[PDB]
Amino acid sequence: XXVFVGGXX
Amino acid sequence: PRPGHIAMVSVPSRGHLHPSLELIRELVARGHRVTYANDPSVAAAVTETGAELVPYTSALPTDQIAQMDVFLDDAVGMLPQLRAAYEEDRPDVFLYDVLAYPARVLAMNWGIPSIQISPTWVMPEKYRERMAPVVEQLKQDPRGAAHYRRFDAWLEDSGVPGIDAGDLVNLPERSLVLVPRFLQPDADDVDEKRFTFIGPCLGRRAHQGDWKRPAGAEKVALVSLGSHLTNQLPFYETCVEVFAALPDWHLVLQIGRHVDAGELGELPPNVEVHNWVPQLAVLEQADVFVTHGGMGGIQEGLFSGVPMVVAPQANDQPANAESVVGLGIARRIDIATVTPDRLRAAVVELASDPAVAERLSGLRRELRAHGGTMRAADLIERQLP
């Protein structure tokens, strides 16, 4: 997700 | 065990193909029937593995919410294609890359076990809480709130309403993490009942040509920012500026397929420039390696025992830069603000430090000890009937 968002893409 | 049908699913994005090729090749070599679902654009890599290519059309190819919408589009498109391909040919187990999580939804529908294949470090159920403010702020945006609603609707429409959109994707039932534990941030919070640190899955040298150190060059440096968007000519000019005035050193500068524009007058005799190089061959003779810090390059540096100067940019890279620096085998720089003396100091100091060389030898022994291809294949076979 860009930076790794973890709670989604 | 008995033969059995193993289905691998991945995506055409470049960081999601190479990590598992040797694993798939090993499963094929063990006599199993392996099918590999991926976009036809990577049919060469899939078929070279020996698995049966199962083609599906990927939706993966300038905004953060838009990037999430592209991924959700790919998930919505992938699942019916996977369902159609495997409806009458259901596998004994589904193996899926992190971005191929619709295969898990399919596995849940059919009561088939699934195993995630992660090409980089995972986000433990403690990493996610630190990101909870970012997620909530995204949900305040109408675009973000619309995205998470569509995601939840896709889960409900696909027959998995009981699972959260985060847990699906980032909390797999079983996961093979293709990195060593020392490259996983916060390895403490990773439940190893669920995630197994395998390290890289290797299977003998890839060849691709041999590279011999030019006679008269005492030290060799490789500069390769191998994260697709290698569009930094000003940094490349700093690198030649550094290694020109750095005799006894030979620079191998890999600029990427997108450039080769405006080099020098034939370049200093120190520098040799390529659009692509046999990276493992050059690292065999390298004394330092300058990379973005992608997981592929870092593991290749570790395997070759080559110290690294890391210039993180993309989402994965900042943590990877921290890990190798924390291991005492790397120096971190910023391409925007790096100086010719600053870049040169990291290069010359890293290559000459004997303690750095000793730590690399230790990391090489630690690296192989995670089990690699054979352990990953053995764990997958435990899921077969």
Residue numbers in the entry:
A (entry chain E): 2 to 10
B (entry chain A): 2 to 62, 72 to 395
Question: Which statements did the authors publish about this structure?
Answer:
The monomeric Kcn28 contains two Rossmann-like β/α/β domains. The N-terminal domain from residues 6–208 is a substrate binding domain consisting of seven parallel β-strands that are flanked by seven α-helices, while the C-terminal domain comprising residues 229–392 is a UDP-sugar binding domain with six parallel β-strands surrounded by seven α-helices. A glycosyltransferase with relatively broad substrate specificity transfers sugars to the newly generated OH/COOH group.
We further attempted to understand the structural basis of the Kcn28-catalyzed enzymatic reaction. Crystal structures of Kcn28 as a free enzyme and in a binary complex (with 9) were obtained at 2.50 and 2.24 Å resolution, respectively. The model of 9 was confidently built into well-defined electron densities. Superposition of free and complexed structures revealed a global conformational change. Specifically, the side chains of F81, V108, and L109 create a hydrophobic environment to accommodate the cinnamic moiety of 9. In addition, the side chain of W131 provides hydrophobic interaction with the Phe residue of the macrocyclic peptide. The side chains of Q74, Q77, Y137, Y158 and N180 provide hydrogen bond interactions with the macrocyclic peptide backbone. Site-directed mutagenesis of the above key residues revealed diminished or abolished enzyme activities, supporting their roles in substrate binding. Consistent with the hypothesis, the H17A mutant renders the enzyme inactive.
